[PDB]
Design a protein around this motif. Structure first.
Motif, PDB file in Angstrom:
ATOM      1  N   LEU A 134      -9.582  -2.531   3.415  1.00 23.84           N
ATOM      2  CA  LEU A 134      -9.199  -2.461   1.988  1.00 23.84           C
ATOM      3  C   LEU A 134      -8.676  -3.797   1.441  1.00 23.84           C
ATOM      4  O   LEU A 134      -8.938  -4.161   0.289  1.00 23.84           O
ATOM      5  N   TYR A 173       0.833  -1.213   0.000  1.00 24.77           N
ATOM      6  CA  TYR A 173       0.000   0.000   0.000  1.00 24.77           C
ATOM      7  C   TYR A 173       0.883   1.286   0.000  1.00 24.77           C
ATOM      8  O   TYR A 173       1.712   1.475   0.902  1.00 24.77           O
ATOM      9  N   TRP A 224     -10.967   2.825  -6.993  1.00 29.05           N
ATOM     10  CA  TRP A 224     -12.014   2.544  -5.984  1.00 29.05           C
ATOM     11  C   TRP A 224     -12.356   3.747  -5.129  1.00 29.05           C
ATOM     12  O   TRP A 224     -11.477   4.482  -4.690  1.00 29.05           O
ATOM     13  N   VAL A 245     -15.561   0.770  -0.182  1.00 21.04           N
ATOM     14  CA  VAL A 245     -15.505  -0.673   0.103  1.00 21.04           C
ATOM     15  C   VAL A 245     -16.928  -1.245   0.241  1.00 21.04           C
ATOM     16  O   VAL A 245     -17.148  -2.449   0.012  1.00 21.04           O
ATOM     17  N   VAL A 247      -7.165  -1.730  -5.159  1.00 23.12           N
ATOM     18  CA  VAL A 247      -8.007  -0.708  -4.541  1.00 23.12           C
ATOM     19  C   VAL A 247      -7.360   0.682  -4.587  1.00 23.12           C
ATOM     20  O   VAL A 247      -8.027   1.690  -4.326  1.00 23.12           O
ATOM     21  N   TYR A 248      -6.068   0.728  -4.900  1.00 22.85           N
ATOM     22  CA  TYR A 248      -5.337   1.982  -5.135  1.00 22.85           C
ATOM     23  C   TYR A 248      -5.446   2.419  -6.588  1.00 22.85           C
ATOM     24  O   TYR A 248      -5.850   3.557  -6.902  1.00 22.85           O
ATOM     25  N   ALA A 296      -6.499   7.473   2.467  1.00 24.75           N
ATOM     26  CA  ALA A 296      -7.824   6.919   2.717  1.00 24.75           C
ATOM     27  C   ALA A 296      -8.235   7.256   4.150  1.00 24.75           C
ATOM     28  O   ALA A 296      -7.375   7.527   4.994  1.00 24.75           O
ATOM     29  N   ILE A 325     -14.080   4.924   0.870  1.00 24.71           N
ATOM     30  CA  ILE A 325     -12.626   4.877   1.062  1.00 24.71           C
ATOM     31  C   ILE A 325     -12.012   6.242   1.488  1.00 24.71           C
ATOM     32  O   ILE A 325     -11.027   6.257   2.233  1.00 24.71           O
TER      33      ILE A 325
END
Ligand code: ZN
Length: 271
Positions: free
Chosen positions: A40, A27, A102, A105, A70-71, A33, A109
């Motif tokens: 995540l 990450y 994204w 969730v 998700v990034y 976030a 986020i």
């Protein structure tokens, strides 16, 4: 800090190019976030790259993302952004389906809209390198061999039907094979993969609920370019809460090694 790993064959190469876009667990500090990373880790297709470790051992190429989907999600198109998620206007037309970036969730986020600049930097630093590596592998294969077989590799949660907006009268299969209803891969390979997996005791569904856009772009079998998306039901190999390999990991990896050897043989015979 490298945005991807690229496992190349030690011996004879074959035009089998495999990517795991969703397996990244590193990450970035600049995520910004408001949600705990433990929330995540949800959208990670965790360990999918290790499940398919055999690929370079049989002559294939395995590409995998190190950043989290998700990034930024390498399996989306660059125009798959909703204007409303950005602070400011995007320079070019957007065509959301969303996504590439994204936004939440669950039905959030961030506590803010992302800047155009911020998303552009994600794209340059993580997506473009990943996709350049995939292009280079796919086009390199095709240029040398005159054919290519691309596998797009995933895992899915047990409630994939609930999370998509689908009520299925059937249970979710152990493997879902997406080829855009039989258009992106020549049929003999889809038949091979399905048959080999069912023989080992797994359930296999085609195009249900995952049919494959990257796959439509890469897979044009009339030009001898083939693409197949493969999705593995997560309980088969990990614990969805902790994300940790379970007792099925070893046996599944073994089964996929044996399946991969069979696919390598099919590919060599098809060139
Ligand atoms: Zn995935």
């Amino acid at each position: 800090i490298a945005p991807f790993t690229l496992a190349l064959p030690e011996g004879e190469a074959l035009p089998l190019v495999c990517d795991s876009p969703h397996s990244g667990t590193f990450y970035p500090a600049d995520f910004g976030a408001v949600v705990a990373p433990e929330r995540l880790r949800g959208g990670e297709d965790t360990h999918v790259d290790a499940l398919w470790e055999a690929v370079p051992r049989v002559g294939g190429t395995l590409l995998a993302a190190t950043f989290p989907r998700v990034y930024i999600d390498p399996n989306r198109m660059l125009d798959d952004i909703d204007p409303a998620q950005l602070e400011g206007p995007w320079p070019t037309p957007l065509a959301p389906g969303t996504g590439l970036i994204w936004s939440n969730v669950d039905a959030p986020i961030y506590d803010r809209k992302l800047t155009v600049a911020e998303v552009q930097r994600r794209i340059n630093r993580y997506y473009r390198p990943y996709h350049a590596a995939l292009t280079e592998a796919v086009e390199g294969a095709y240029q040398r061999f005159g054919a290519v077989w691309h596998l797009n590799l995933h895992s899915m949660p047990n409630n994939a039907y609930e999370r998509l907006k689908i009520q299925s009268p059937r249970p979710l299969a152990d493997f879902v094979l997406g080829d855009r209803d039989g258009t992106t891969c020549e049929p003999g390979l889809v038949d091979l993969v399905e048959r080999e997996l069912r023989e080992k005791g797994y359930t296999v569904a085609r195009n249900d609920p995952y049919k494959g856009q990257l796959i439509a772009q890469i897979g044009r079998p009339a030009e001898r370019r083939n693409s197949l998306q493969i999705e593995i039901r997560r309980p088969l190999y990990m614990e969805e809460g902790t994300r940790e390999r379970n007792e099925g990991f070893a046996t599944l990896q073994r089964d996929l090694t044996l399946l991969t050897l069979r696919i390598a043989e099919y590919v060599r015979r098809g060139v």
